[PDB]
């Protein structure tokens, strides 16, 4: 109850109008600041205790940013568009040693989004579901987070079937990209910890903080 897709869409429209790895890390750090503002625009999020707000963002920031640049890259030929306005071509990513993860983003996320023409409302809702992850460890009231999530996909399904009546399986199709997002999110984090370990690849303060423990 009280989870209008209009507010979710607004949050998306409000936050967004040579080693490629380094460029990706700078873009991620950059978007981390924008991510917090996006979250504050998601209904009832800011109403949760500060401690749980931190846990939720800590637990889903990687998937949240990935979903975002992936959808942004729908208009891209063979690459990804970073928030900084730079483009990472497949060859560039390949030549940097990150071709494997790059190919997964394109095939499992970008390509699928483009083919089904995922819109900004749907993207917003999927990220809202990810943000409200009831499995996040440390939550003082997991039931409360579970409630918000249920309200999001409840509004999302309503959005679909209504906008896209001719596609009864659209709602499920949207939800079925979450497993790929989870796996891809995990691999990207592994690469980030390796970059931090090796020493090379400058990592900014906010991104570094997210890599911090726990």
């Amino acid at each position: 109850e009280d989870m209008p897709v209009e507010r979710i869409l607004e949050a998306e429209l409000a936050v967004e109008p040579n080693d490629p790895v380094t460029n990706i890390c700078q873009a991620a750090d950059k978007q981390l600041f924008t991510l917090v503002e996006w979250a504050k625009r998601i209904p009832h999020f800011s109403e949760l205790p500060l401690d749980d707000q931190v846990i939720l963002l800590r637990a889903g920031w990687n998937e949240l940013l990935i979903a975002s640049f992936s959808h942004r890259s729908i208009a891209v030929k063979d690459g990804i568009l970073l928030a900084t306005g730079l483009h990472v071509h497949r060859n560039s990513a390949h030549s940097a040693g990150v071709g494997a993860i790059f190919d997964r983003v394109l095939t499992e996320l970008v390509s699928k989004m483009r083919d089904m023409q995922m819109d900004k409302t749907e993207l917003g809702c999927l990220r809202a579901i990810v943000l409200f992850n009831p499995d996040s460890k440390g939550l003082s009231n997991p039931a409360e987070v579970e409630a918000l999530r249920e309200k999001v996909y409840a509004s999302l399904e309503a959005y679909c079937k209504h906008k896209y009546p001719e596609q009864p399986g659209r709602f499920a199709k949207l939800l079925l990209r979450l497993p790929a997002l989870r796996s891809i999110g995990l691999k990207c984090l592994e690469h980030l910890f390796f970059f931090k370990l090796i020493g090379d690849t400058p990592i900014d303060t906010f991104l570094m903080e997210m890599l911090e423990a726990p």
């Binding site: 600041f33 917090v36 504050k40 800011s46 500060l50 707000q53 931190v54 963002l57 800590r58 303060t205 906010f206 903080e209 911090e212 423990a213």
Partner: peptide, 11 residues
């Protein structure tokens, strides 16, 4: 901990 994140959320 989580210096940056807390400050941003509070603002």
């Amino acid at each position: 901990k989580h210096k940056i994140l807390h400050r941003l959320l509070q603002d």
